[PDB]
Amino acid sequence: GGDTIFGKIIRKEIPAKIIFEDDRCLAFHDISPQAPTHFLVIPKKHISQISVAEDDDESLLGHLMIVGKKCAADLGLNKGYRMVVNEGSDGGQSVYHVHLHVLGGRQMHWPPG
Amino acid sequence: GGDTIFGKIIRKEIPAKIIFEDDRCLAFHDISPQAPTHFLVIPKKHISQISVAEDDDESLLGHLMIVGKKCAADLGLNKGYRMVVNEGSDGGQSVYHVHLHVLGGRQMHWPPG
């Protein structure tokens, strides 16, 4: 679902190193990692951005985080990690399809950008 | 919701600049802001860190994101913002009580720390 790149990855038109997939989301590695381990977890349902997510979208949004921490553990991120969700211009949302990033493998700093 | 300074805030034992509150979560401004608007949304339930969230906390975790989006709206963050969850040492988690940071009011940069 979607007119973005994520649309293409979800419809399997273009490869992605999939880490996990199920009926509701997809987790794969980011091709421009900002850290040793850097993947995204995306809902298969198209939600352009968190600012427009519906109340009925909370279980789906919570699933994205649950999946992210499971993936983070399988990837051996036993020292910690950071999850980020960007919204619009100020947040730096590049692709307008909701996506959670998980970064780890290195010490993350403060502020988070 | 426990022994951290976030538990004291939930029990109304120490003051906080409370933004919103319902039966399962609380949103308040960060006492050490890294952006013009910087707040936290936390569960009343004491979950020490995202890595030990149970599968049942799923909608609760999604609910923290929905509440964050709604708060962002009422704080005037129309140009976007960044949502962040920190896990452990490498993630830079400063309190062992699950919390979602929402930052906006300025251009956020990449990488996210």
Side-chain angles (χ1 to χ4, degrees), chain B residues 46-64:
Chain B
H46 184 225
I47 302 167
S48 59
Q49 44 194 120
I50 190 73
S51 57
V52 291
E54 315 163 49
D55 283 56
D56 313 286
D57 296 334
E58 210 162 80
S59 59
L60 176 58
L61 289 188
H63 182 261
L64 304 185

mmCIF file of all heavy atoms in Angstrom, chain B residues 46-64:
data_model
loop_
_atom_site.group_PDB
_atom_site.id
_atom_site.type_symbol
_atom_site.label_atom_id
_atom_site.label_comp_id
_atom_site.label_asym_id
_atom_site.label_seq_id
_atom_site.Cartn_x
_atom_site.Cartn_y
_atom_site.Cartn_z
ATOM 1 N N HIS B 46 4.284 0.948 35.390
ATOM 2 C CA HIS B 46 5.743 0.994 35.406
ATOM 3 C C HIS B 46 6.399 -0.118 34.559
ATOM 4 O O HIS B 46 6.413 -1.286 34.952
ATOM 5 C CB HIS B 46 6.321 0.979 36.833
ATOM 6 C CG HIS B 46 7.818 1.121 36.871
ATOM 7 N ND1 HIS B 46 8.630 0.340 37.670
ATOM 8 C CD2 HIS B 46 8.659 1.907 36.144
ATOM 9 C CE1 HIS B 46 9.900 0.631 37.430
ATOM 10 N NE2 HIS B 46 9.940 1.579 36.504
ATOM 11 N N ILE B 47 6.877 0.260 33.377
ATOM 12 C CA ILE B 47 7.607 -0.635 32.463
ATOM 13 C C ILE B 47 8.972 0.050 32.453
ATOM 14 O O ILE B 47 9.062 1.205 32.054
ATOM 15 C CB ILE B 47 7.005 -0.633 31.023
ATOM 16 C CG1 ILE B 47 5.533 -1.045 31.044
ATOM 17 C CG2 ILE B 47 7.784 -1.588 30.136
ATOM 18 C CD1 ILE B 47 4.825 -0.764 29.763
ATOM 19 N N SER B 48 10.010 -0.633 32.939
ATOM 20 C CA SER B 48 11.333 -0.031 33.037
ATOM 21 C C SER B 48 11.987 0.347 31.737
ATOM 22 O O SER B 48 12.747 1.296 31.698
ATOM 23 C CB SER B 48 12.294 -0.890 33.856
ATOM 24 O OG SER B 48 12.437 -2.174 33.291
ATOM 25 N N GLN B 49 11.729 -0.400 30.678
ATOM 26 C CA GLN B 49 12.322 -0.067 29.398
ATOM 27 C C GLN B 49 11.614 -0.822 28.304
ATOM 28 O O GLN B 49 11.022 -1.853 28.567
ATOM 29 C CB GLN B 49 13.806 -0.388 29.433
ATOM 30 C CG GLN B 49 14.106 -1.711 30.063
ATOM 31 C CD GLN B 49 15.558 -1.863 30.396
ATOM 32 O OE1 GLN B 49 15.915 -2.040 31.544
ATOM 33 N NE2 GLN B 49 16.408 -1.807 29.387
ATOM 34 N N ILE B 50 11.635 -0.266 27.094
ATOM 35 C CA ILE B 50 10.991 -0.828 25.906
ATOM 36 C C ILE B 50 11.374 -2.302 25.638
ATOM 37 O O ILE B 50 10.524 -3.094 25.195
ATOM 38 C CB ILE B 50 11.256 0.102 24.644
ATOM 39 C CG1 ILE B 50 10.422 -0.315 23.455
ATOM 40 C CG2 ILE B 50 12.682 0.000 24.148
ATOM 41 C CD1 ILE B 50 8.992 0.033 23.590
ATOM 42 N N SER B 51 12.612 -2.690 25.966
ATOM 43 C CA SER B 51 13.054 -4.057 25.723
ATOM 44 C C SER B 51 12.301 -5.108 26.525
ATOM 45 O O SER B 51 12.262 -6.269 26.134
ATOM 46 C CB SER B 51 14.573 -4.196 25.890
ATOM 47 O OG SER B 51 15.028 -3.788 27.166
ATOM 48 N N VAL B 52 11.671 -4.710 27.620
ATOM 49 C CA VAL B 52 10.920 -5.648 28.417
ATOM 50 C C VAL B 52 9.439 -5.369 28.354
ATOM 51 O O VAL B 52 8.714 -5.680 29.279
ATOM 52 C CB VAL B 52 11.379 -5.687 29.882
ATOM 53 C CG1 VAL B 52 12.783 -6.304 29.974
ATOM 54 C CG2 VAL B 52 11.383 -4.293 30.471
ATOM 55 N N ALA B 53 8.975 -4.747 27.280
ATOM 56 C CA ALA B 53 7.553 -4.498 27.172
ATOM 57 C C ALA B 53 7.031 -5.849 26.727
ATOM 58 O O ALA B 53 7.707 -6.573 25.991
ATOM 59 C CB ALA B 53 7.262 -3.445 26.134
ATOM 60 N N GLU B 54 5.859 -6.197 27.236
ATOM 61 C CA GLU B 54 5.194 -7.448 26.938
ATOM 62 C C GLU B 54 4.333 -7.210 25.728
ATOM 63 O O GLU B 54 3.980 -6.078 25.424
ATOM 64 C CB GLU B 54 4.289 -7.809 28.094
ATOM 65 C CG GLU B 54 4.942 -7.631 29.452
ATOM 66 C CD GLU B 54 3.911 -7.608 30.582
ATOM 67 O OE1 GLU B 54 3.044 -8.533 30.587
ATOM 68 O OE2 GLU B 54 3.947 -6.649 31.422
ATOM 69 N N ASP B 55 3.933 -8.287 25.076
ATOM 70 C CA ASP B 55 3.097 -8.175 23.900
ATOM 71 C C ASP B 55 1.753 -7.497 24.201
ATOM 72 O O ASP B 55 1.179 -6.858 23.308
ATOM 73 C CB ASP B 55 2.908 -9.545 23.261
ATOM 74 C CG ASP B 55 4.144 -9.995 22.460
ATOM 75 O OD1 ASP B 55 5.256 -10.041 23.063
ATOM 76 O OD2 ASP B 55 4.020 -10.289 21.227
ATOM 77 N N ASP B 56 1.293 -7.563 25.461
ATOM 78 C CA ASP B 56 0.016 -6.933 25.868
ATOM 79 C C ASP B 56 0.054 -5.417 26.027
ATOM 80 O O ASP B 56 -0.993 -4.773 26.158
ATOM 81 C CB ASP B 56 -0.432 -7.457 27.205
ATOM 82 C CG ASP B 56 -0.347 -8.904 27.277
ATOM 83 O OD1 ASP B 56 -1.216 -9.561 26.641
ATOM 84 O OD2 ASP B 56 0.609 -9.398 27.932
ATOM 85 N N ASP B 57 1.264 -4.889 26.186
ATOM 86 C CA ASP B 57 1.508 -3.462 26.342
ATOM 87 C C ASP B 57 1.422 -2.802 24.945
ATOM 88 O O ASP B 57 1.506 -1.581 24.814
ATOM 89 C CB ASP B 57 2.927 -3.259 26.929
ATOM 90 C CG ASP B 57 3.084 -3.831 28.353
ATOM 91 O OD1 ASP B 57 2.065 -3.933 29.061
ATOM 92 O OD2 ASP B 57 4.224 -4.147 28.790
ATOM 93 N N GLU B 58 1.186 -3.607 23.913
ATOM 94 C CA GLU B 58 1.139 -3.121 22.540
ATOM 95 C C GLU B 58 0.289 -1.910 22.260
ATOM 96 O O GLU B 58 0.783 -0.925 21.727
ATOM 97 C CB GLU B 58 0.712 -4.239 21.610
ATOM 98 C CG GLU B 58 1.293 -4.081 20.230
ATOM 99 C CD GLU B 58 1.236 -5.373 19.448
ATOM 100 O OE1 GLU B 58 0.143 -5.670 18.917
ATOM 101 O OE2 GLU B 58 2.268 -6.090 19.382
ATOM 102 N N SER B 59 -0.996 -1.997 22.586
ATOM 103 C CA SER B 59 -1.888 -0.870 22.346
ATOM 104 C C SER B 59 -1.577 0.279 23.289
ATOM 105 O O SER B 59 -1.869 1.426 22.960
ATOM 106 C CB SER B 59 -3.358 -1.274 22.439
ATOM 107 O OG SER B 59 -3.660 -1.809 23.705
ATOM 108 N N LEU B 60 -1.007 -0.037 24.462
ATOM 109 C CA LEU B 60 -0.617 0.996 25.423
ATOM 110 C C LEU B 60 0.499 1.803 24.789
ATOM 111 O O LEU B 60 0.447 3.035 24.767
ATOM 112 C CB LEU B 60 -0.152 0.406 26.759
ATOM 113 C CG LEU B 60 0.390 1.365 27.851
ATOM 114 C CD1 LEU B 60 -0.605 2.425 28.249
ATOM 115 C CD2 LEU B 60 0.800 0.569 29.062
ATOM 116 N N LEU B 61 1.465 1.107 24.201
ATOM 117 C CA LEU B 61 2.587 1.779 23.553
ATOM 118 C C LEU B 61 2.088 2.612 22.379
ATOM 119 O O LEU B 61 2.555 3.730 22.164
ATOM 120 C CB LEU B 61 3.657 0.776 23.095
ATOM 121 C CG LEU B 61 4.529 0.042 24.117
ATOM 122 C CD1 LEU B 61 5.611 -0.725 23.371
ATOM 123 C CD2 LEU B 61 5.162 1.012 25.093
ATOM 124 N N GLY B 62 1.126 2.079 21.633
ATOM 125 C CA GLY B 62 0.580 2.823 20.512
ATOM 126 C C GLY B 62 -0.206 4.019 21.015
ATOM 127 O O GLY B 62 -0.241 5.079 20.379
ATOM 128 N N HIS B 63 -0.838 3.852 22.172
ATOM 129 C CA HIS B 63 -1.612 4.919 22.795
ATOM 130 C C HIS B 63 -0.709 6.091 23.219
ATOM 131 O O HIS B 63 -1.130 7.246 23.174
ATOM 132 C CB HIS B 63 -2.382 4.380 23.980
ATOM 133 C CG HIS B 63 -3.237 5.399 24.647
ATOM 134 N ND1 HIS B 63 -2.849 6.051 25.792
ATOM 135 C CD2 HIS B 63 -4.457 5.887 24.331
ATOM 136 C CE1 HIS B 63 -3.787 6.900 26.154
ATOM 137 N NE2 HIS B 63 -4.777 6.820 25.286
ATOM 138 N N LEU B 64 0.522 5.790 23.640
ATOM 139 C CA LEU B 64 1.466 6.847 23.992
ATOM 140 C C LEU B 64 1.790 7.662 22.730
ATOM 141 O O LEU B 64 2.038 8.844 22.829
ATOM 142 C CB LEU B 64 2.776 6.295 24.563
ATOM 143 C CG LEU B 64 2.816 5.370 25.785
ATOM 144 C CD1 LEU B 64 4.293 5.133 26.142
ATOM 145 C CD2 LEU B 64 2.072 5.955 26.967
#
